[model samples]
Target: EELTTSTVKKFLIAYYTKKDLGENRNRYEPLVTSAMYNELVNVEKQPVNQAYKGYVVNQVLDTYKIYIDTENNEVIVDVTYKNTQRTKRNNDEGALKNQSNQEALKLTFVKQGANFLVDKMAPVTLTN
Candidate 1:
């Protein structure tokens, strides 16, 4: 749990790979500042899907790479992921679609007892 680039990668993985959007605050809580959990990241329920008798329309992270840096004494994580679309029936992930999209998410973190947790929109001097 020492603050490292891999830790940042775990944070990113938790953020995007965890279940429904803001529904599982428990997943983000320890990894993210309480303030940010409330103010900065706005979790929602827009893209939730239904297979509807076997239609292929789900996407998931195929792979990801993360870079960690520091500024203002805060941790900045830059991550890029290949979100590959899936063709599914119900259980199987089915076949990977021909198209996969790339995306980037920027997360900022402040240290708390040698562990770096998420803090995207707030200044470090302001809070923990």
Candidate 2:
């Protein structure tokens, strides 16, 4: 698919939304790079013990920090989420017990013909 800044935002929003719900995930194959797809496949191998609501990107337009550094063919994004590291239960009712935290994700793009493809994606440790 052709890549642009708008598509990048949509990708992140859809990727993280309902992700921590940890069930019935949306299809991301058409939008991800080969390596990213592999990452998704590997992630699906483990079962989430606690299905908590994690990151928030659905409001990317207002709440997220998105940097499109085309000179380096990279995009860095920061979003907020309720950290679930301390939660002890599973499923929906097991959701609201944790505090919130901010996180960042980096999406690197590669130009192919007339379009760009996200070649890599990873969470960046936010120092601030």
Candidate 3:
């Protein structure tokens, strides 16, 4: 199932989130490599300091065009997000959104405690 575009698409759907901890994301680790699993889980370890929630109404799979670090079998996801809105409950408004303003989330995954978790996140910039 992991050999076709639909497979990754399925994974994306399962893992994409707006409110965190849903039914789909619960089952995305085993399909991906071990490294991807670890990174993803670790992110959840941090405190709920703030949030950059979005609808994620749409996405495009750019697997071939994205950065796949074969050395670690790791890839950097470059998703094109849509209908993204932001709110601030902590820290400065500019700081909260400025660091993560892009539609796409830059992420990698690694294994941890027999599960896969998101590692890093950065917004895809479309400006000069």
Candidate 4:
């Protein structure tokens, strides 16, 4: 997809959607490039789900803060969701509980052969 502000948000929605829906592989092919696919799906060798991966219930774009950097082909977004704290490395139900998970992330996209794809993404920390 052409990584416009709208498309970028949509792509992220699709990302979480794919995970929550438990769809088959290649679900993100149309929205992301191979690099992004690798990062999102293949990065975790032994992936374990500790919490819900879907969009927070009753949440919308209006609840998010988005910053666009056209020059850098990047977007910064702040979102709030329900989170779980794991007492150990493994996914253990007894160690899980709901918590406020507010996070800011910087997403970088790259234009490749007439298509735009997410190149990287990382959490952003704010300091005074």
Candidate 5:
């Protein structure tokens, strides 16, 4: 289904609501029963959620945010992250150098239920 504002609103509401409840609820419980919940939580546990896994690059790596442009029918996140805390580590740091570079991403969604489930994501690019 094509993502609509109404669907996005519902999705957000459910997503945040589930997020709030998930903090306390046991994963095995029935409220969040699907494997998707587990996957979502697992992703959240990562150093950075929803980041590309393989790539070598150096850039910002914090203060990241996601914005869904419903009008544009796109979910957009800034590709660049600024690391407020930097260690002496070099690009050899795999997770730090390539994957979690605060790289922005934009995704197209198929409207399902109340929110837009990520149908597919475009390749993240670095402009700087």
Candidate 6:
């Protein structure tokens, strides 16, 4: 489906990659608003989890469903993914194990000019 090729979806991929990289915050500067960028900056200031020391968090998108709300002039995308957080100890050095958690996320985006930007993001539970 064209949903896989949507610009906003592509943007999400880059955004998550930047997060996993642990630096280069400016990589997403053009895609998000100043307020959103500030929020990310604040999050970066928080203390890192000891369990996640030495390795960055990564999100692997597995599947997604998209819906457009014509009345609200927004798009809703539900993304199911695996979050892999790694940890490394000195004795093992580079040896690390991946702890993956299955997660579902709902992302809302609003059109700004000709492009779209994320308006909100929250965790969601899905049922069969």
* Candidate 4 backbone collisions, by pair: none
Point out the worst 10-residue segment of candidate 6 by lDDT.
Answer: 89-98
Model 4, position 49: C-alpha lDDT score = 34
Candidate 6 regions exceeding 4 Å error are 1-5, 19-21, 48-53, 57-62, 80-86, 89-99
Question: With candidate 2 superimposed using the best TM-score fit, by how many Å does residue 85's alpha carbon deviate from the native?
Answer: 10
TM-score of 1: 0.55
* Candidate 5: tens digits of C-alpha lDDT, residues 1-128: 44554543333333332222234234322322244456556755676532422232332234445566656568665543322122333334334423233445555665455544555444475465
Residues 32-99, model 4: lDDT tens digits? 67776777665433335324333222221224566888787888887655444445544554454444
**Full ranking by lDDT:** 2, 4, 6, 1, 3, 5
TM-scores vs. true structure, each candidate? 0.55, 0.62, 0.39, 0.60, 0.34, 0.60
lDDT of 5: 0.43
For candidate 5, the TM-score is 0.34
Number of the top lDDT candidate: 2
> Which candidate, 2 or 5, would have the higher lDDT against the true structure?
2
- Writing each residue's lDDT as its tens digit, candidate 2 over 18-121 gives 43443324445656777777776666565553332343112212356778886787899887744343234344344443456567888887766665666788
Off by over 4 Å in 4: 1-3, 18-25, 47-62, 82-100
What are the clashing pairs of model 2?
none
Residues 11-80 of candidate 3 have per-residue lDDT tens digits of 5655653333322335766555555557556664455412332322222222322554545534555554
The per-prediction tally of clashing pairs is 0, 0, 17, 0, 10, 0
Clashing pairs in 6: none
Cα RMSD (Å) between model 6 and the true structure? 4.4
lDDT of 6 by residue, 1-128 (tens): 12223766675555555325444466666666667678766666677633353464454555666665655534555655554444453233444334333445565555667666665666666757
Q: Per-model C-alpha lDDT, please? A: 0.52, 0.59, 0.43, 0.59, 0.43, 0.55
